[PDB]
Every structure is written in structure tokens, then in C-alpha cells.
Design a protein around this ligand. Structure first.
Ligand code: HEM
Ligand code: HEM
Ligand SMILES: O=C1N[C@@H](Cc2c[nH]c3ccccc23)C(=O)N[C@H]1Cc1c[nH]c2ccccc12
Ligand SMILES: O=C1N[C@@H](Cc2c[nH]c3ccccc23)C(=O)N[C@H]1Cc1c[nH]c2ccccc12
Ligand SMILES: Nc1nc2[nH]cnc2c(=O)[nH]1
Ligand SMILES: Nc1nc2[nH]cnc2c(=O)[nH]1
Lengths: 390, 390
């Protein structure tokens, strides 16, 4: 027989029909990834949660030489185990402090001013505008520059590094390594500036070195937090914007009841299709999952949108609903590798969307949603441009 | 039977197989355009040249209400007849003077400095780089700002207007009009600045008004020359860059024999697939073309890549050849509507490519060519990003 192909459709404004078929017919399914390797794709909520919470399915080992892959590695293999290294070298406190919105008491107001500065610029020029290049991208880059303690002068160059680093390729491509060492050197340069960095992660790193871990490791943590955070928050915010543009009753709700923003972002997180690949794990032992015997060394892929649209857990999953009794979604993952920046991720989006619905109350797409250009060959699903009117 | 669909593949680094099949099997072919309308697609060189040179096939009338269309009009219908209006209002001299590289004796050196400034910035940051956002786009925008006599401060906003204005849509979309009047107002504002514009097209327009045509018409000419010129030169240069990256022997030729740049750009023009739609005409009378009787009022579409790859006129058309005995290509069209800026278009590309092969002698793509993202739904074919190493 012929295996289902993975990944699924690049279109991000509706659940791929194949994700619903996989969950209903084979919630654990043998698929052929873009590399030609085979994998177990897990698409029901119950089994996805199980995999994430069972440490016999290893994220760290997905980077090992010889294992099957959903796409070529574009970063050093130790970086897939970023949190595992952050913990072992005594970096966790500096990292966890940086990721905590409660440790930066100005963050809230500063993010709000950043959002409004960007939106005011767009309003001055008049519609239409591209809310990716004109809003999400600079806003997400500005946040992560603040997190690291670096200026925003080179934010376009840094976001362009993300455009290469998060490519999904069937085979390794020259360029991934060149791109990695390019921005690793950038981070080293910032850490080792004569007027040594204060503020943010690089400021904490500078202090940590003078106390009684190498420069390459410090910059690696800085670079991978910048790239992973900026690309994930920018892509999620783009998906959230599309929802509020296509469903203006949701923006009316946010304007009428500003305090629902927390629940609203929690539901947009469940709904959002920005994860354009699956969460990967290598089985370290034989494990039975659902009706399938998974053998040690095989690749397991957790399909987050399959789980988050599972009607056994989320009634009317295809309908955005800010008033669900229960919303135990997997948008941030689960288990050991649950997103350590989930609070910052929520803050980023809540503040941006609050500013957006206030400043652009007639927000709508400037063209039918089916004519958005969805980026191919990337870890995230995202529109190449997000043209809107207001 | 089922008609062939138009447009053809968005992939721009190889001729679409369908373009070769159409030319060989039905060089005048009934096709279904993206609007659902029907058209005559002309794909052989002999018949394409015939249409372009026969004024019974009208460009001006392609904008008329009720006529069949290859895609929705995104601009006022009078703007499709831009040159026809420029001529009638006594604007031709100011326009033709602006479009002449010989009327701006600093242009050559200035373009060369612009190219090298952009490339030096990329070299300082190190590879990889996106040569669209980092080179073609700002270089093409800088040229057209110079042409008009406006500063480059808002070049990103202006190129984003191009991203909307040149969309191909099956039906009219809100946004096209909003976008047009947005940048029309921008051009009015520049023309009507208190420190009145000197220099360029707006400087000539300001003088022309005080002499013994409205503000809207003047800004319309400015806006449509900016958009058409910037989008066409940027897209062509991107296609030329891909060729020199994929065929480094061509860059060796340019470095060894700098004076061949004129012939080299002439061949890259024949080869280039940046025109992603066809040149449209409405038949004003019944005309027999090839084996087909075309009736008055029908839509005729000239497929430039079919003509420019016609082996009856260009031997080994699939192979770039800087030493062809004869190269009567249709990259700039033909007949009455032949590109009035062809000399500027050649200068733009010749200077950029000369700088490129000097500054990035090891230029190559940073990923297999098949993994470039080609933009959908646009008049031009272009890679969304052009990542390169050197
Ligand atoms: C809307 C925003 C975000 C979403 C949807 C998101 C989602 C996720 C998901 C699904 C995982 C689990 C991956 C797996 O299990 O294989 C994860 C892990 C991770 N994310 Fe987030 N992320 C977001 C923002 C951020 C931010 C702001 C940062 C950093 C500044 C960040 C840093 C990380 C790191 C370091 C990990 C790995 C954790 C580990 O391996 O233990 N993320 N994220
Ligand atoms: C590499 C660059 C360029 C290419 C490949 C190109 C190609 C063409 C083609 C194929 C046509 C004929 C359209 C038809 O017959 O329907 C045309 C027309 C035109 N182009 Fe160019 N173009 C380029 C650059 C420019 C520049 C730099 C400008 C302006 C600054 C410009 C302005 C125009 C105008 C106004 C027309 C309409 C002429 C008429 O209707 O009589 N183009 N171009
Ligand atoms: O910290 C990490 N932990 C895991 C899981 C993970 C966290 N955030 C992600 C966002 C997308 C994909 C995977 C992850 C990982 O795989 N790598 C990095 C992040 C990263 C930095 N640059 C990259 C280029 C390519 C892929 C990942 C990264
Ligand atoms: O001057 C023009 N003459 C014709 C032919 C033409 C010249 N250069 C082109 C480049 C692409 C497509 C058509 C043309 C036309 O159609 N319009 C305009 C150009 C233009 C300004 N903005 C636009 C948005 C959309 C489409 C065209 C324009
Ligand atoms: N595999 C994967 N891991 C992530 N961690 C955070 N975001 C993502 C994503 O899109 N894919
Ligand atoms: N139809 C059409 N006309 C043009 N004139 C200049 N460039 C183009 C193009 O790509 N398409």
C-alpha cells in the first residue's frame, strides 16, 4: 500500500482535511516524511498527550546521527536538547528569570507601547498594510531583542536568519551551517562587547562568567531562544490576526470585555495552525500506543492540530469559542518539554491583540482569505504577507 | 473537451513544460483564465510578434467593462492606457526625458555606487543573504525614487504597495482601489510639497504646470511608472541572479570580459521568466491568426516565454548563450506598446550584475533551486526570498 505523506497542507486558515481523516481512521499512522523516512504520526488528543508525557519518547535523540527524520537538521544536534544543556550548566536560573514576564515589571507597558507605535505608524500611512512585516515581525523581534539585552538595530537581519534556520528540507543544505555560525558570531560579539552588556539574558550571562560553560554555549542559548521565540510568537500572532479579521464578532467581544483577553488567547492558541510540522520523538524502548506497537529507534510525530481539534475533548472544535468550560489544549506541548516561555507567549499575544482591536476596529483582510500566500518548506505555517484593511 | 488552464506554473527557473506543449501543438489555443473567462493564448514567436505589431489587437481596450479578462483589474481602466494618455496631454517629453539614461549623465555612476553600497552591507554581515530584500528590491526602489525625484525614505512602504497592486485575482478585491488611492495621494503630496520638487519626473511636472492636465493625472503617471518599473526591474534582476548563481561559468565570462555585459543581459532577457501572465489584447475586428479565426471582442494573450523559447527562432532555446548570432527576443514586447524604458531596464540590470559578479565571485544558491518559494497570485514570477552564499 501507499503511505500518507507528511507534512500536511501549508494552508493555515482551516484545519487540513487530512488531519481530521488521520485522527478518525488511524490516530497512530505510518507516514512517509519529506525525507523519505517513515514515522508514526499521532493525531488524537489522548495519544498525543500520552507521547508528550512519556519520557521513553525522546526529543533529545531526534538529533542523533542515523535516526529517521521528518526533515534535515539545520542546527547543531546539541541545540535540539537546548533545555537539557541549560539545566546541566547552571544556566536555568538566568534563563528562567529571562523568560518570566513577572521578572521584568516594565514588560507589560513596554510591549503595549511597542504595539501602539507600530500600529500608529500604519494608521498614519493608511490602509492597506502588511501586518506581518509592519507589525508581528518587528514586534516579535523587539521583544526578543529586549529579552537578550541587545539593540533592535539589526532586527531585519536577525529575522532573515530565522527565514533560513527554520527551513524544512529533505536533505541537509549548505547554508544552514553557514547561517547558524553567522548569527552565533553575532551573539558572541554582543556578549563580548567592551561596554559589556547589562540588561537581559546577555547581561545575566556576563555576570555569570565573572562569578566563581563557554562563550559558544552562552551564545548558542541566546541564539536559539531568540530564533525559537521570535518565529513562534510572530507566526502565532499572524494566525490570531487572521481569526479576528475573518470573525469580527470576536474583536467586538474583546473590545466590549477587555478582561476576556486571557481566555481568548487561550482559545486562539488551541485553534492556531502555526505549527507546520509535528513534535518529534525517538522511541527509546518498545512501547504500545493505541493499537500500534512502536519499536525502539523509530520516529514518532505528535500532530498538535489533530489533538487540539479532537472532538472527544473539544466540542465543535472547528468553531472558535472563547467560553469553553475546559480548554486543556496542547498548543505549548506537554510533559517534560512543555514550552518554558508559555507565559511570555501569552503576554506577547494578549497585549498585541488588545492594541490591535482598539486601534483597527474595522480590521478585515484586504483580499479573500483563500488568496493569501502560505509559505512552503518552513517549520511554521504563515502567510508570506498579511494584507488588511481597516 | 476541457480547456487548458492559464496562467502556467509559478516556478520561474525552468520553462513550464506546458509552454512548450502549447507552442508545439496549438500555438493559438483556447484557454480558460483564472477568472473563468476564455481567451486565445498565443505561444509561437511568429504569431506573438504578429499580434504585438497589429494594432487591431488593442491593449487599451483590455480595461473596458464587460470584456473577458485574465484577472481582475486592480487599477483605474485609463491607467492600462498610460502611454496613450501621456501622449495626449503633452506629457511625453517629460516622460521620455525621465526614461532616457542619456538624459541623466550621473545615472551610471550613481547606480553603480548604489549596487556596491548594498553589496558591501551584505558582505559586512556575511553569508547567507536574501538578495531580494537585501539587493534587488532596494536597488530597484532607489532607481525609481530617483526617476521621480522623491526621497527613498518610504521605499519599503512603496514596494509594499506594489505587492498589492500587481496581485492577480479572479474577482475584484476590496483593497486594490484603497491601495491605489493610498499611493496616488502619496504622489500628490510629493508633487505639491511647499518646497516644490525639483529633479526627476515630479520636478518636470511642477515646471510643466506653471507653463502656459490635472494633479490626479500627473500623480497617476508618477505612480504607475514607479510601480511598473520597480516591479519589472526587480523581478527580472532576481531571475538573472538565479541564472548566474546556477551557472557560474556565466559569471566567469562576465568577470573575464566585462564588455559582454550588454549581450549577456540581452540573452538573460530572452531567457527570463519574470513575466508571469501574458500580454493582453482585445480584438477590435475579426482577424485570422495562424489556423484560428479570432472574433472581435475576444481576449488574446501573448505568451512571451513561448515566443522567446521558440526553436524556430532561437536554437537550443533552453540553454543560455551569450554568443547568439541573432537575438530578436520579445522580452520588452513589440509594436506600438514596446517598453518605453527598455534602455533604462538594460542599464539597471547591467550595472547590478557587473557589481554582483565582482563583489560575490563565489555566488551560489544557499539551498537547491527546487526549494525556492515562488510567489503565487502575482503578475510577476519571483522567489519570495533569494537566499545565496558567496
Ligand atoms: C506563541 C508562542 C509559542 C508557541 C505556540 C510555542 C510552542 C512550543 C511547543 C509546542 C513546544 C514543545 C516542543 C516539543 O515538545 O518538541 C515548545 C518548546 C520550547 N519553546 Fe515554546 N512556543 C512559543 C513561544 C516561545 C518563546 C517566546 C520562547 C523563547 C523565548 C520559546 C522557547 C522554547 C524552548 C526553549 C522550548 C524547548 C523546551 C524543552 O525542550 O524542554 N517558545 N514551544
Ligand atoms: C527589465 C525590465 C522591464 C521589462 C522586462 C519590461 C517589459 C515590458 C513589456 C513586455 C511591455 C509591453 C506590455 C504590452 O505590450 O502589453 C512593457 C510596457 C511598458 N513598460 Fe516596461 N519592462 C521593464 C521595465 C520598465 C521600466 C523601468 C518602466 C518604467 C519606469 C517601464 C514602463 C513601461 C510602460 C509605461 C509600458 C507601457 C507602454 C505602452 O503601453 O505603450 N518598464 N514593458
Ligand atoms: O531550543 C530548542 N529546542 C528544540 C525544540 C523547539 C523549541 N522551539 C522550536 C521551534 C521550532 C522547532 C523546534 C523547536 C529544537 O528543536 N530546537 C531549539 C529551538 C530552535 C532554535 N533554532 C532552531 C532552528 C530550527 C529548529 C529549531 C530551532
Ligand atoms: O503603464 C501601464 N501600462 C499597462 C502595461 C504595463 C506596463 N508595465 C506593466 C507591468 C505589469 C503589468 C502590465 C504592465 C498596464 O496594464 N498598466 C500600467 C502599469 C501598471 C502600473 N500599476 C499597475 C498595476 C497592475 C498592472 C499594471 C500596472
Ligand atoms: N517541532 C516543533 N517544535 C516547536 N516548538 C515550538 N514551536 C514548534 C514548532 O512549530 N514545531
Ligand atoms: N501583462 C504584462 N505586461 C507587462 N509590461 C511589463 N511587464 C509586464 C508583465 O509582466 N505583464
Amino acid at each position: 500500500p501507499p503511505l500518507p505523506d507528511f507534512p500536511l497542507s501549508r494552508r493555515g486558515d482551516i484545519l487540513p482535511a487530512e488531519a481530521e481523516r488521520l485522527r478518525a481512521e488511524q490516530p497512530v499512522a505510518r507516514v512517509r516524511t519529506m525525507t523519505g523516512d517513515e514515522a508514526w504520526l499521532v493525531s488524537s488528543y489522548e495519544l498525543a498527550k500520552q507521547v508528550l508525557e512519556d519520557d521513553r519518547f525522546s526529543l533529545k535523540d531526534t538529533a542523533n546521527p542515523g535516526v529517521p527524520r521528518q526533515y534535515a537538521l539545520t542546527i547543531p544536534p546539541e541545540v535540539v536538547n537546548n533545555m537539557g544543556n541549560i539545566n546541566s550548566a547552571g544556566l536555568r536560573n538566568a534563563v528562567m528569570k529571562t523568560l518570566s514576564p513577572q521578572a521584568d515589571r516594565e514588560l507589560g507597558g513596554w510591549l503595549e507601547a511597542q504595539a501602539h507605535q507600530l500600529l500608529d505608524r500604519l494608521i498614519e500611512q493608511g490602509p492597506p498594510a502588511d501586518l506581518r512585516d509592519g507589525f508581528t515581525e518587528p514586534y516579535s523581534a523587539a521583544l526578543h531583542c529586549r529579552l537578550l539585552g541587545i539593540p533592535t538595530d539589526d532586527w531585519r537581519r536577525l529575522m532573515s536568519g530565522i527565514d533560513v534556520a527554520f527551513i524544512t528540507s529533505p536533505r541537509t543544505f549548505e547554508g544552514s551551517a553557514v547561517n547558524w555560525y553567522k548569527d552565533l558570531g553575532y551573539m558572541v560579539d554582543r556578549l563580548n562587547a567592551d561596554p559589556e552588556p547589562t540588561e537581559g539574558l546577555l547581561g545575566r550571562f556576563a555576570e555569570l562568567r565573572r562569578s566563581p560553560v563557554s562563550d559558544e554555549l552562552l551564545a548558542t542559548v541566546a541564539l536559539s531562544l531568540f530564533g525559537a521565540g521570535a518565529v513562534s510568537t510572530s507566526a502565532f500572532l499572524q494566525h490570531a490576526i487572521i481569526a479576528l479579521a475573518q470573525q469580527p464578532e470576536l474583536a467586538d467581544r474583546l473590545r466590549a470585555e477587555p478582561a476576556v483577553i486571557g481566555r481568548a488567547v487561550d482559545e486562539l492558541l488551541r485553534y492556531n495552525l502555526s505549527i507546520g510540522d509535528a513534535l518529534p520523538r525517538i522511541a527509546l524502548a518498545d512501547v504500545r500506543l493505541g493499537e500500534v506497537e512502536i519499536r525502539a529507534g523509530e520516529l514518532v510525530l505528535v500532530l498538535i492540530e489533530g489533538a487540539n481539534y479532537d472532538p472527544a475533548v473539544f466540542p465543535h472544535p472547528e468553531r472558535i469559542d472563547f467560553d469553553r468550560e475546559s480548554n486543556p489544549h496542547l498548543a505549548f506541548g506537554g510533559g517534560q518539554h512543555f514550552c518554558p516561555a508559555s507565559a511570555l507567549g501569552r503576554t506577547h499575544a494578549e497585549i498585541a491583540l488588545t492594541a490591535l482591536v482598539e486601534k483597527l476596529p474595522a480590521l478585515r483582510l484586504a483580499l479573500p482569505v483563500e488568496q493569501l500566500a502560505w509559505r512552503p518548506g518552513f517549520i511554521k505555517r504563515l502567510p508570506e504577507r498579511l494584507p488588511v484593511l481597516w
